[PDB]
């Protein structure tokens, strides 16, 4: 049993930035795969970004490459996005899931085992 | 696409037998082409088994006549481990490659856990 918990998002102006973190409850953090994934008003979820297990390779979907960077402090329990030259077209709910996925189909939701409640972040002009 | 069914943890007896599950619904136009399953070494998997068009081939010696893989109903491409040492603790990936019927392929993996108790 494993709870997903998002914090930092909120409101950020056009080419700001901001850090979003999960934090995952459990014994064995290291061995799964971490995912990013954002659902726009009037769209479908979509893939962000994640992180693999054990060495931890990271993926990152075409639109955010650059832009974003995703991490983890295995420690503590937690996985970073940092989100750098945010623009308006990054509105979303941002969602945190979990799966056991090693090296492949880190982008595939039904891949995942945990989901997060996911948080609001909106980028203004 | 397809998705592996794999529990995240086994626990098997010390000296004994233990199965390893993974399963997946074959989806159609979906040709399997290739079943591995690794043992993880910090951050390298490690192939000890490898199922292609050419048969069955286990990777080290220390598992011949211990290794075994599901082969019956397609789907199912459980990992039987036969004697558990304690050295046999590890996380395990199973891998499985499949062919459409564009040519392109598509690759699946989930790891499992394996606990050996005393």
Redesign the interface.
């Known amino acids: 049993q494993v709870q997903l918990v998002e914090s930092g998002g909120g409101l950020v102006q056009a080419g700001g930035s901001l850090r979003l973190s999960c934090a995952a409850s459990g014994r064995?953090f290291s061995?799964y795969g971490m995912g990013w994934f954002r659902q726009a008003p009037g769209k479908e979820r979509e893939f962000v970004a994640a992180i693999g297990?054990?060495?931890g390779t990271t993926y990152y979907a075409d639109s955010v490459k650059g832009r974003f960077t995703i991490s983890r402090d295995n420690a503590k329990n937690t996985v970073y996005l940092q989100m750098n030259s945010l623009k308006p077209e990054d509105t979303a709910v941002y969602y945190c899931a979990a799966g056991?996925?090693?090296?492949?189909?880190e982008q595939?939701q039904?891949?995942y085992?945990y989901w997060g409640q996911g948080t609001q972040v909106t980028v203004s002009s | 696409?397809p998705?592996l069914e794999?529990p995240?943890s086994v626990t098997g007896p010390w000296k004994g037998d233990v199965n390893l599950p993974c399963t997946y619904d074959p989806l159609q136009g979906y040709t399997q082409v290739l079943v591995k399953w690794?043992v993880?070494r910090?951050?390298?998997?490690v192939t000890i088994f490898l199922r292609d068009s050419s048969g069955d081939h286990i990777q080290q010696a220390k598992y011949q006549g211990r290794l075994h893989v599901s082969h019956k109903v397609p789907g199912d491409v459980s990992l039987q481990l036969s004697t558990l040492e304690m050295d046999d603790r590890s996380?395990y990936?199973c891998?499985v490659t499949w062919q459409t019927p564009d040519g392109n392929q598509v690759?699946?993996?989930?790891?499992?856990?394996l606990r050996v108790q005393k």
């Open positions: 064995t061995s297990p054990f060495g056991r996925w090693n090296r492949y189909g595939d039904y891949n085992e | 696409r998705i794999v995240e690794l993880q910090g951050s390298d998997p996380h990936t891998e690759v699946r993996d989930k790891i499992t856990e």
